[PDB]
Amino acid sequence: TRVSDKVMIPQDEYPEINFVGLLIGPRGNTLKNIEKECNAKIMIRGKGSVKEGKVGRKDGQMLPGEDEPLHALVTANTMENVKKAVEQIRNILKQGIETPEDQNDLRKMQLRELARLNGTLR
């Protein structure tokens, strides 16, 4: 008895940017956070998901990157738990680094969650 629900990333305009980053966190703060909240399982699948085609780490495609577009598959037990979980996740992607007019100034805040956490805050 497990429910699934991934978050679609606007790969039509943006590649994967901090969508995978912010959604993850340092090592995976955002991932484990929502995981400990509604008992969900965050796992981004697609091109830029497991830092296999980005910078920082080593290069060398290991997982197929021609099928999955760019989404963060979040599992759980009930649709309710995964629902609220996906909600926050959207607040991270939907806004990403080009957050709506609601904020915009805090567009870089998605990087502060990790920064202020590891002292990486300006």
Going by their DSSP bridges, the two strands 70-76 and 41-46 should be labelled as antiparallel
Q: Is the dihedral of CA 51, 111, 119, 44 positive or negative?
A: negative
Q: Is the dihedral of CA 28, 31, 35, 37 positive or negative?
A: positive
CB of 55 to RNA, least distance (A): 7
Query: Which residue in the set 1, 2, 64, 101 belongs to the binding site for RNA (CB under 7 A)?
Result: 64
* 57-76 residues labelled b (16+ CB within 10 A) or e (exposed): eeeeeeeebeeeebbbbbbb
Select the span of 5-13, 63-71, 78-86 touching RNA (CB under 7 A).
63-71
86 binds RNA (CB under 7 A): no
Phi and psi for 8 in degrees, rounded to 5?
A: -75, 130
22 binds RNA (CB under 7 A): yes
Query: Which residue in the set 54, 83, 84, 94 belongs to the binding site for RNA (CB under 7 A)?
Result: 54
Select the span of 2-10, 43-51, 80-88 touching RNA (CB under 7 A).
43-51
Residues that bind RNA (CB under 7 A): 16-18, 20-22, 24-29, 31, 41-46, 48-51, 54-57, 62-64, 68, 72, 97, 108-115, 119-122
